[PDB]
Design a protein around this ligand. Structure first.
Ligand SMILES: CC(C)[C@H](C(=O)O)N(CCNC(=O)c1cccc(C(=O)NCCN([C@@H](C(=O)O)C(C)C)S(=O)(=O)c2ccc(-c3ccccc3)cc2)c1)S(=O)(=O)c1ccc(-c2ccccc2)cc1
Ligand SMILES: [Ca+2]
Ligand SMILES: [Ca+2]
Ligand SMILES: [Ca+2]
Ligand SMILES: [Ca+2]
Ligand SMILES: [Ca+2]
Ligand SMILES: [Ca+2]
Ligand SMILES: [Zn+2]
Ligand SMILES: [Zn+2]
Ligand SMILES: [Zn+2]
Ligand SMILES: [Zn+2]
Lengths: 159, 159
């Protein structure tokens, strides 16, 4: 593990799918979440369906083999490991939440943007309107934009 | 590691009342939340009516004059200032949340326990069992107990 990915070409794989959403909507939410970050960095993300990916996206509940157990519905929503091999980079989403394309649950796209930020080495922001602020609030995903603080943060890590 | 209150007799006043629950239930939630901390320290909390209360409890929404704006329903729930004169110690609750006596919305008692922790000088815990863990999840308020970590934390400040 370290502060940054030591390469700019980073693969991801969707390990399994939440039954809360259509699989194609999960694929789209995750693809768009990676795009948020590739839009403002030299990082390039590719989805793979076979083989070992850098960032594994997982839906799981309770204790799921990483010593950071999820806690049922509410509370912790998701977590991600910083850059590194193996579990490094991986992003886990609590299946006990109800994942949604928009609101009426926990929005997958917004949560994935936040978690991928961690996967890339970004920590939390103290600006409530940054996506890296450590609280979830739904915003219209159609008009979602990274805050200037988020852009500054990720560009500071990847020149 | 501080600041801490340099006294053991600490006063509070409830400035205003959320319309989400009856006033008696607000008074009770706040009283019980102070008692949680009193039960494990030599601190004594008293409710007063006058203008120099140590800890003022206030419900407010949006930007409310202290450079720490609330954010509507969702996201931020409340915040509190650490020990100090004036606004120091004060605890503010986001009125755009729906404050409850039991399991739905956001439970006022539990949130008040957490915020009073901050008012007394405690920071966040990484232990998910601790009330000072920085994520809200409802637990049955009749089985609620401070974690060993919370007790160690507050006793390290006040004995
Ligand atoms: C580290 C992980 C476990 C994970 C993560 O960040 O990936 N989580 C974070 C866990 N929290 C932290 O690691 C952390 C670390 C340092 C500081 C903070 C923090 O200050 N958070 C805000 C705290 N709040 C106030 C307060 O603590 O008084 C204040 C500082 C603004 S609060 O209003 O949100 C709050 C108030 C009361 C309580 C509370 C706790 C116990 C009982 C009753 C109430 C909890 C939070 C949080 S999370 O909760 O599962 C999570 C949160 C947000 C998102 C997200 C999704 C989409 C878009 C944007 C964000 C995804 C996942
Ligand atoms: Ca959860
Ligand atoms: Ca990995
Ligand atoms: Ca689910
Ligand atoms: Ca709020
Ligand atoms: Ca005060
Ligand atoms: Ca309210
Ligand atoms: Zn995990
Ligand atoms: Zn986070
Ligand atoms: Zn305030
Ligand atoms: Zn807190």
């Amino acid at each position: 593990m370290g502060p940054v990915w030591r390469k700019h070409y980073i693969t991801y794989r969707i390990n399994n799918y939440t039954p809360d959403m259509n699989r194609e909507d999960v694929d789209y939410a995750i693809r768009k979440a990676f795009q948020v970050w590739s839009n403002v960095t030299p990082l390039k993300f590719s989805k793979i369906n076979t083989g070992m990916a850098d960032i594994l996206v997982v839906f799981a509940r309770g204790a799921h083999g990483d010593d950071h157990a999820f806690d049922g519905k509410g509370g912790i929503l998701a977590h991600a490991f910083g850059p590194g091999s193996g579990i490094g980079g991986d992003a886990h989403f609590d299946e006990d939440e109800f994942w949604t394309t928009h609101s009426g649950g926990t929005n997958l796209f917004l949560t994935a943007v936040h978690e991928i930020g961690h996967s890339l080495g970004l920590g939390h922001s103290s600006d409530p309107k940054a996506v890296m602020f450590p609280t979830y609030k739904y915003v219209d995903i159609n008009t979602f934009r990274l805050s200037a603080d988020d852009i500054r943060g990720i560009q500071s890590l990847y020149g």
